[PDB]
Amino acid sequence: HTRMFSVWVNGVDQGDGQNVYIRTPPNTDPIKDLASPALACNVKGGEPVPQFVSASAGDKLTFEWYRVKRGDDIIDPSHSGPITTWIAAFTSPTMDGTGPVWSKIHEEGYDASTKSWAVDKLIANKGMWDFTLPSQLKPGKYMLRQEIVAHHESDATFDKNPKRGAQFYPSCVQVDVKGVGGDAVPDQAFDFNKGYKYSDPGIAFDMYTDFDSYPIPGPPVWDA
Ligand SMILES: [Cu+2]
């Protein structure tokens, strides 16, 4: 359980973004069903919010998360897993992020040399998660998606045992990307409902074994 409070642009807080520029779900509940339409942008994913974070291609964005209250424990430390960030063109206001539209722009999984997960790091940095908007990115409106996945019950899959399974916590953010050049259009066209499967070693993952590493689902980070 966790959701986003706000976005920071080059370390400057843009202010409470819930129902402003963040497509904030009603609560912190996990998505577990891979066929759910909510997988991409959570339960209110298709409802426009009125504002776009203003950022430049190349900027460092920070997404700030919380649990119940801004600046709390952020997420239960039981919930180890990766954090992935994605981008999609903002096709129209009532997009819900379903279909083949997404390109992965950042990922952290398991760092074996420290034996910490992306979520461990999220907690130690008090819910601040940093990534870069690619500088080659063609200016325009986009949806940014950041997703926490908790694997404390991923030793079962949801299809076999509905009371268990990987828990997905996606957050979709409206961004208006100011240009500086950049010609590059995200073109992985990844589709969470088709592309995430129960057979995925990164989804069917047992964290109660002597594993040395973790295969993060979906394609490698996009380049061009
Ligand atoms: Cu939870």
Side-chain angles (χ1 to χ4, degrees):
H1 302 58
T2 187
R3 63 194 179 158
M4 291 195 36
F5 186 77
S6 72
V7 174
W8 303 54
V9 170
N10 296 327
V12 174
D13 188 6
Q14 306 297 284
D16 186 5
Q18 297 167 101
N19 299 302
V20 174
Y21 49 74
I22 307 176
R23 292 191 180 204
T24 299
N27 66 40
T28 53
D29 280 15
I31 309 303
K32 289 210 299 177
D33 184 346
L34 291 184
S36 178
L39 182 57
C41 282
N42 217 311
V43 185
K44 282 186 97 272
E47 292 222 62
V49 290
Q51 287 321 298
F52 296 77
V53 181
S54 189
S56 258
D59 281 348
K60 160 222 271 302
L61 302 180
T62 309
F63 288 8
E64 178 189 343
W65 302 71
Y66 78 110
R67 193 203 194 147
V68 168
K69 256 193 113 151
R70 192 172 185 179
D72 64 3
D73 51 340
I74 313 289
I75 201 196
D76 188 311
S78 82
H79 289 35
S80 310
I83 308 179
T84 55
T85 308
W86 309 69
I87 194 166
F90 185 88
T91 41
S92 71
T94 52
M95 80 183 272
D96 63 15
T98 54
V101 301
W102 293 96
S103 290
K104 180 193 283 164
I105 69 173
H106 183 268
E107 68 186 2
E108 275 191 60
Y110 183 71
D111 168 28
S113 20
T114 50
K115 313 163 101 59
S116 67
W117 288 88
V119 166
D120 295 312
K121 173 160 163 196
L122 176 67
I123 291 168
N125 290 330
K126 307 175 95 311
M128 303 302 179
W129 195 259
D130 291 347
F131 66 96
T132 306
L133 273 192
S135 57
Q136 305 77 12
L137 185 66
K138 175 166 153 185
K141 283 155 145 118
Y142 297 85
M143 197 76 81
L144 280 159
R145 177 187 179 262
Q146 195 168 96
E147 168 180 69
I148 300 159
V149 190
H151 285 308
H152 57 292
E153 298 187 327
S154 298
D155 43 9
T157 53
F158 175 94
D159 57 337
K160 300 259 278 300
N161 185 348
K163 288 183 188 133
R164 292 189 68 81
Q167 287 170 15
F168 299 79
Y169 298 92
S171 202
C172 285
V173 171
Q174 302 183 177
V175 184
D176 191 10
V177 178
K178 278 106 260 263
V180 263
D183 216 37
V185 190
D187 59 344
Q188 294 186 149
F190 195 74
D191 182 328
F192 291 108
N193 296 299
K194 232 207 129 189
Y196 280 9
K197 317 142 171 298
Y198 294 119
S199 64
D200 196 312
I203 291 181
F205 187 73
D206 181 6
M207 45 157 58
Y208 305 107
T209 62
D210 253 335
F211 73 94
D212 204 67
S213 77
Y214 172 78
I216 302 169
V221 165
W222 174 61
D223 216 339

